[PDB]
Amino acid sequence: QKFKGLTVLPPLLTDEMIAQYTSALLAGTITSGWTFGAGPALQIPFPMQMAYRFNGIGVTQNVLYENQKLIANQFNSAIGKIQDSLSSTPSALGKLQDV
Amino acid sequence: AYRFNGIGVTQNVLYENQKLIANQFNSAIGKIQDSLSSTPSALGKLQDVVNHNAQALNTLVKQLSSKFGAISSVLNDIFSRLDPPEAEVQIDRLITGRLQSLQTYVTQQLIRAAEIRASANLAATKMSECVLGQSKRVDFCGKGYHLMSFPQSAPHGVVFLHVTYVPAQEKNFTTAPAICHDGKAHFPREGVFVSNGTHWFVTQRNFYEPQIITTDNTFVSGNCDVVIGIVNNTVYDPLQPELD
Amino acid sequence: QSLQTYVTQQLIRAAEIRASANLAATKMSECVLGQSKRVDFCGKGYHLM
Amino acid sequence: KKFLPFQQFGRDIADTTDAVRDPQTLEILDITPCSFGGVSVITPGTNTSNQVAVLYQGVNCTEVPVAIHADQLTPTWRVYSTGSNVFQTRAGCLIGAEYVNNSYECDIPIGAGICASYQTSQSIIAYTMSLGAENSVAYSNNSIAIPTNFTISVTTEILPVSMTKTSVDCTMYICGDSTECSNLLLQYGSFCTQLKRALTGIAVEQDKNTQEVFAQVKQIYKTPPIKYFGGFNFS
Amino acid sequence: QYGSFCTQLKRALTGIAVEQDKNTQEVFAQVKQIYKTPPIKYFGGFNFS
Ligand SMILES: *[C@@H]1O[C@H](CO)[C@@H](O[C@@H]2O[C@H](CO)[C@@H](O)[C@H](O)[C@H]2NC(C)=O)[C@H](O)[C@H]1NC(C)=O
Ligand SMILES: *[C@@H]1O[C@H](CO)[C@@H](O[C@@H]2O[C@H](CO)[C@@H](O)[C@H](O)[C@H]2NC(C)=O)[C@H](O)[C@H]1NC(C)=O
Ligand SMILES: *[C@@H]1O[C@H](CO)[C@@H](O[C@@H]2O[C@H](CO)[C@@H](O)[C@H](O)[C@H]2NC(C)=O)[C@H](O)[C@H]1NC(C)=O
Ligand SMILES: *[C@@H]1O[C@H](CO)[C@@H](O[C@@H]2O[C@H](CO)[C@@H](O)[C@H](O)[C@H]2NC(C)=O)[C@H](O)[C@H]1NC(C)=O
Ligand SMILES: *[C@@H]1O[C@H](CO)[C@@H](O[C@@H]2O[C@H](CO)[C@@H](O)[C@H](O)[C@H]2NC(C)=O)[C@H](O)[C@H]1NC(C)=O
Ligand SMILES: *[C@@H]1O[C@H](CO)[C@@H](O)[C@H](O)[C@H]1NC(C)=O
Ligand SMILES: *[C@@H]1O[C@H](CO)[C@@H](O)[C@H](O)[C@H]1NC(C)=O
Ligand SMILES: *[C@@H]1O[C@H](CO)[C@@H](O)[C@H](O)[C@H]1NC(C)=O
Ligand SMILES: *[C@@H]1O[C@H](CO)[C@@H](O)[C@H](O)[C@H]1NC(C)=O
Ligand SMILES: *[C@@H]1O[C@H](CO)[C@@H](O)[C@H](O)[C@H]1NC(C)=O
Numbered sequence: 001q002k003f004k005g006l007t008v009l010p011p012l013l014t015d016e017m018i019a020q021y022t023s024a025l026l027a028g029t030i031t032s033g034w035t036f037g038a039g040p041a042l043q044i045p046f047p048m049q050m051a052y053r054f055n056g057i058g059v060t061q062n063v064l065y066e067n068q069k070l071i072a073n074q075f076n077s078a079i080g081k082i083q084d085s086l087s088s089t090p091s092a093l094g095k096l097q098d099v
Numbered sequence: 100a101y102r103f104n105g106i107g108v109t110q111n112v113l114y115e116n117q118k119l120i121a122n123q124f125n126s127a128i129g130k131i132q133d134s135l136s137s138t139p140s141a142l143g144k145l146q147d148v149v150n151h152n153a154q155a156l157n158t159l160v161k162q163l164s165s166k167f168g169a170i171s172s173v174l175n176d177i178f179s180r181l182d183p184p185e186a187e188v189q190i191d192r193l194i195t196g197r198l199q200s201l202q203t204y205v206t207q208q209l210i211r212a213a214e215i216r217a218s219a220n221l222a223a224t225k226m227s228e229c230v231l232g233q234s235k236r237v238d239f240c241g242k243g244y245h246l247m248s249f250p251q252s253a254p255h256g257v258v259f260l261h262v263t264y265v266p267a268q269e270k271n272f273t274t275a276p277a278i279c280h281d282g283k284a285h286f287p288r289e290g291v292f293v294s295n296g297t298h299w300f301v302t303q304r305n306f307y308e309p310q311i312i313t314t315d316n317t318f319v320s321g322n323c324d325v326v327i328g329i330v331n332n333t334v335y336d337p338l339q340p341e342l343d
Numbered sequence: 344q345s346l347q348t349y350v351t352q353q354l355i356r357a358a359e360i361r362a363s364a365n366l367a368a369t370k371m372s373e374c375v376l377g378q379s380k381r382v383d384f385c386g387k388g389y390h391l392m
Numbered sequence: 393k394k395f396l397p398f399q400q401f402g403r404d405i406a407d408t409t410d411a412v413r414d415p416q417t418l419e420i421l422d423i424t425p426c427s428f429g430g431v432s433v434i435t436p437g438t439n440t441s442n443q444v445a446v447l448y449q450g451v452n453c454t455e456v457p458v459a460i461h462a463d464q465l466t467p468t469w470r471v472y473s474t475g476s477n478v479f480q481t482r483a484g485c486l487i488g489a490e491y492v493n494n495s496y497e498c499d500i501p502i503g504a505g506i507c508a509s510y511q512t513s514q515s516i517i518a519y520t521m522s523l524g525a526e527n528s529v530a531y532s533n534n535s536i537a538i539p540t541n542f543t544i545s546v547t548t549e550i551l552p553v554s555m556t557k558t559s560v561d562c563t564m565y566i567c568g569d570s571t572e573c574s575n576l577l578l579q580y581g582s583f584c585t586q587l588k589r590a591l592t593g594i595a596v597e598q599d600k601n602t603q604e605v606f607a608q609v610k611q612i613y614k615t616p617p618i619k620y621f622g623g624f625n626f627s
Numbered sequence: 628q629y630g631s632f633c634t635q636l637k638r639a640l641t642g643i644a645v646e647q648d649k650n651t652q653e654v655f656a657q658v659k660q661i662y663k664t665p666p667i668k669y670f671g672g673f674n675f676s
Contacts, residue, residue: 001406002450003408003425003427004406004408004427005428005431007449007450009449009503009644009665010482010483010503010504011481011503011647011648011651012498012501012505012648012651012652013504013505013648013652013655014504014649015606016505017505017523018651018655020523020661021523021655021656021658022655023659023661024523024524024536024661024662025371025375025376025657025658025665026664026675027529027662027663027664028328028529028658028662029375029376029392030434030531030664030670030675031529031531031662031664032529032662034237034376034377034378034507035266036376036658036662037237037238037372037376037377037657037658038237038242038244038265038266038377039243039265039266039267039539040266040269040539041515041527041529041660041662042266042269042536042537042538043273043470043529043530043532043536043537044533044536044537045274045531045532045534045535045536045671046670046671046673047276047328047671048274048276048291048302048536050391051276051391052304053378053391054391056378056380057389057390057391058389060286060320061286062277062284062286062320062321064324065276065277065286065325065326065327066320066321066326068327068671068672069217069672072671072672072673072674073672075673076673076674077661079464079674079675099360103645117622118623120544121622121623121624121625122623123543123544124373124546124625125624125625127544127545127546128546128625129408130546131546131548131610135548138507140673141550142550144550144551145567148552148555148556149556152555152556152558156558158631158635160633161631163565165628165629165631166496166628174567174568174570174573175570178570178572183572187466187576190573190576191576194566194567194573194576194580195524197565197566198351198566198580198583201560201562201565201566201587202583202587203347205587205591206351207354207588207639208558208590208591208594209590209594210354210355210358211555212555212594212597212598213358214358214419215552215553215554215555215598215601216597216601217362218551218552218553219551219552219553219554219601219605220604221551221603222551222552222605223604223605223608224554225549225551226605226606226608227608231608235377236372236379236571237372237373237377238372238373238376238657239372239373241545241547241549242545242547243545246407246544251471253550253551255552255554255555256551256552256554257550257551257553257605257606258548258549258550258551259548259549259551260546260547260548261547261548261549262544262545262546263544263546263547264542264543264544264545265542265543265544266539266541266542266543267539267540267541267542267543268539268540268541269537269538269539269540270537270538270539270550271530271535271536271537272535272536272537272538273534273535273536274535274536275532291536291538293536293538302461302538304538305539306538306539306540306542307538307539307540311615327671328533328534332619339454346633346636347636350636350639350640351641353639353643354639354643357643357646357647360647360650361650364650364651364653364654364658365653367654368653368654368657370656371654371655371657376657478669501648523656523661524658524659524661525659525660525661526660526661526663527660527661527662527663528663528665529660529662529663531664531665533669533671
C-alpha cells in the first residue's frame with residue numbers, strides 16, 4: 001500500500017500520553033471524587049465518598065458503613081471476574097477490531 | 100435561591116451575599132463582551148459553514164472549464180467545425196463530466212447536511228435543558244455546577260451563555276464518618292462532620308458553614324461497635340434547657 | 344472514480360466514528376466525572392461510579 | 393527467498409512485482425522502489441517571519457538530499473541545505489528546527505507527540521508536548537477539604553444550526569443556450585429530477601432545523617418597562 | 628486537464644485526518660492537571676491494583 005501512493009499518518013497523541021490521561025482521570029476520581037471535574041480538586045476519604053454515592057441512589061449511608069468489608073469484597077471479586085472474563089471469549093472487542 | 104437549592108447550597112447563602120453575587124455576575128458579562136470582541140479566532144465554527152459552502156460553489160463553477168478529454172469546453176465550437184454525427188462522443192463525454200461533477204456536488208451537500216442536523220439537534224436539546232430548565236448533567240451546560248443559561252442568535256447559529264458556580268477557597272479539616280455519643284452512632288442528616296482541631300461541627304458539603312451537632316441535625320442508626328472510623332463527642336439534644 | 348468512491352465511504356465512516364466519539368465524551372463527562380441518574384446510560388442497575 | 397527454479401517473477405499481496413532472480417547469476421534480489429514522500433511546511437505565519445521548517449513524512453534522512461524533480465524543481469537547493477538542524481522523528485524527519493528538552497503546550501502539531509513553535513535571535517523549535525501541570529492531591533484517611541468562597545462564571549458555547557439553501561437548474565448548468573444539447577440530455581433520463589429532489593429535501597430541512605431550535609415558545613413574552621432585578625444587570 | 632479533481636480529494640482526506648485527532652482530544656483531554664495517586668495504596672479495603 002505504501003508503494004502505490006497511499007500513506008498512513010501517525011496520531012498526534014501516543015499511547016503513553018493517552019495512558020497518562022487515563023491515569024490522571026483515575027487518580028482524580030479516587031482521591032477527590034466528582035469535585036475535580038467542577039473546579040479545584042478537594043480530597044475526601046474513599047468510604048465517605050462511597051457513602052455519598054449511596055445517598056445518590058436513595059440508600060442511607062449507614063448501609064455502607066455497617067457493611068463496608070462485604071462491599072469491598074464484592075467489588076474486588078467483581079474486578080477479578082472482569083479480568084478473567086475479558087481474557088476469555090474472544091469476540092468481546094469486536095467493535096475495535098471492525099475499525 | 101431556587102437555583103442554589105438545585106446545586107446543593109442552602110438558600111441563605113444567596114440572600115446574605117446578594118450584592119456580591121450581583122457584582123460578580125455583572126463583571127462576568129462585561130468580560131464576555133470584551134473577550135469575545137478582542138480575539139480573532141472565536142466564532143470559527145460559524146465561519147467554516149460559510150467558507151465550505153462558498154468553496155464548494157466556486158469548485159462547481161470552476162469545473163465548467165474542464166474539457167473532460169474533449170477538444171473544447173465550448174459547445175458551439177463542438178457544433179461548429181465538426182459534422183453532427185461524429186461530434187456525439189465529445190458532447191456526450193462533456194455531458195457525463197458535467198453530470199458527475201453535479202452529482203459529486205450533491206453527495207457532499209447531503210453529508211454536510213447530516214452533520215448540521217446533528218449539531219442542530221444538539222442545540223435544540225441544549226435550549227430545552229439548559230435555557231428552559233436547570234441541568235444536573237455534568238459539563239453539558241458549562242464547567243461548574245450549572246445555574247442558568249441565556250441564548251443569543253448568531254448568523255447561521257446560536258450562542259449560549261452558561262452561568263455556573265465554581266468553588267473557590269478551600270480549607271483542610273479532620274473528618275469522621277460517625278459520632279458515638281451514648282453508645283449510639285450518629286450520622287449526619289444532610290452534611291458532613293468536620294473538626295477544626297478541638298471541636299466537631301457538621302457542615303454542608305459545598306460551602307463552609309459550621310453548625311452545632313444536635314439531635315435535630317443527625318440521625319441514629321445502630322450502636323458504636325461496627326463503624327470503623329467512629330469518634331467520641333457530645334450531641335446537644337435541645338430539650339434540656341427547655342424543661343422548666 | 345475508484346479514488347472518489349474510496350473517499351466517499353471514508354467520509355461516511357468518519358461521520359459514524361464521530362457519533363461514537365461524541366457519545367464516549369458524554370459518557371466520560373457524565374459517568375466518570377460525576378454520578379448519573381439516567382437509566383441504563385452507565386450500566387444496568389443504579390449507577391455508582 | 394526460495395524461488396522454484398522455473399519461476400522468474402515474484403509478487404506481494406497486492407500483485408506488484410516484488411523479487412526477481414538474477415538471470416545468469418541466479419540469485420534472488422528484492423525490488424524496493426525508491427520514491428515517495430510528502431513535503432510538509434511549518435510556518436509561523438508570514439506576517440511574523442518568513443523562515444520555515446520542512447518535514448519529510450516517512451523517511452530516514454540519511455537519504456534525504458538527492459532530489460525533488462518535476463519540471464525544474466531541482467536538487468540545487470538541497471546540496472548543502474541538509475547540513476545541520478536535522479532531527480529524526482517518528483513522523484519522518486524535520487529540517488530547519490532545533491530540538492529542546494523543554495516541554496510546552498502544543499502550538500503547531502508535527503505528530504507522534506512532537507509539536508513545534510517559533511520563539512526566542514528568533515528560531516523554530518521542536519519539542520515533546522506537555523500534558524499539563526503536575527499535581528498531587530493530599531489524600532489521607534481522615535482529611536477533607538471544604539470550600540469557603542465561590543465564583544460565578546459565565547462561559548460561551550457556539551453551535552451551528554442551519555446552512556445555505558441552494559437549488560439547481562440542470563439544463564442551464566450543463567447545456568445552457570443550445571437546444572441540441574438539451575435533446576441529448578433528454579436521452580440520459582431522470583438524473584436531474586433526482587438531484588433536484590435531493591437539493592429540495594436539504595433546503596426544506598434547513599428551515600426545519602431553525603424552527604426546531606428557536607420556536608420552542610408559543611407566546612411572545614415581554615420584559616417590564618422597569619429594569620430592576622435586584623442588582624442584576626441584563627442590558 | 629483534471630487539475631481540480633484531486634484537490635478536493637486531498638482536502639477531504641485532510642479534514643478527516645484532522646477530525647480524528649480532534650476526536651481523541653475531546654474524549655481524553657478533559658482535565659488540565661495531571662493528578663497522582665498517593666505512594667501508599669490503602670483505600671479502605673478496595674483494591675484498585
Ligand atoms: C476551632 O474552631 C472552634 C470554633 O467553635 C474554636 O472554638 C472557639 O474558640 C474561641 C477562642 O479560641 C472561644 O471563644 C469560643 O467559645 C470557641 N467556641 C466553641 C464552640 O467552643 C476553636 O478555638 C478552634 N480551634 C483552634 C485550634 O483554633
Ligand atoms: C470513646 O468512649 C468510650 C466510652 O465507653 C471508650 O470505651 C471504653 O474504653 C476503655 C479503654 O479505652 C475500656 O476499658 C471500656 O470498657 C470502654 N467502654 C465501652 C463501653 O466499651 C472508648 O475507648 C473511647 N474511644 C476513644 C478513641 O477514646
Ligand atoms: C470571597 O471572594 C470575593 C472575591 O471577589 C471576596 O471579595 C473581595 O474582598 C476583598 C476584601 O475582603 C475586597 O477588597 C474586594 O473588593 C472584594 N471583591 C469583590 C468583587 O467584592 C470576598 O471577600 C471573599 N469572601 C470571604 C469570606 O473571604
Ligand atoms: C448596566 O451596565 C452597563 C455597563 O456597560 C451600564 O452602562 C454604562 O452606564 C454608564 C452610566 O450609567 C455610562 O457612562 C456608560 O457609558 C455605560 N456603558 C455602556 C457600554 O453603555 C448601565 O448603566 C447599567 N444599567 C443600570 C440600570 O445600571
Ligand atoms: C490487590 O489485589 C491483587 C489481586 O491480583 C493482589 O495481588 C495478588 O496477591 C497475592 C498475594 O498477596 C499473589 O499471590 C497474587 O499472585 C497476586 N496477583 C497478581 C495478579 O499479582 C494484591 O496483593 C492485592 N493488594 C493488597 C494490598 O492486598
Ligand atoms: C492540606 O494539607 C496538606 C498537608 O497537610 C497540604 O499539602 C495541602 O496544601 C493542604 N490544603 C490546603 C488547602 O491548605
Ligand atoms: C521452505 O521449507 C523448508 C522446509 O520446510 C524450510 O526451510 C522453510 O520452512 C521454507 N523456506 C525456506 C526459505 O527455506
Ligand atoms: C533508519 O535508520 C536507522 C539508522 O541506521 C536504522 O536503524 C533503521 O533501520 C532505518 N529505517 C529504515 C526504514 O530505513
Ligand atoms: C537535551 O536533548 C539532547 C538530545 O535529545 C540530549 O543529548 C541532551 O542531553 C539534553 N539535555 C539535557 C540537559 O537533558
Ligand atoms: C490511614 O492509613 C494509615 C496507613 O495505611 C493507617 O495506619 C491508619 O490507621 C489509617 N487511618 C484510619 C483512621 O484508618
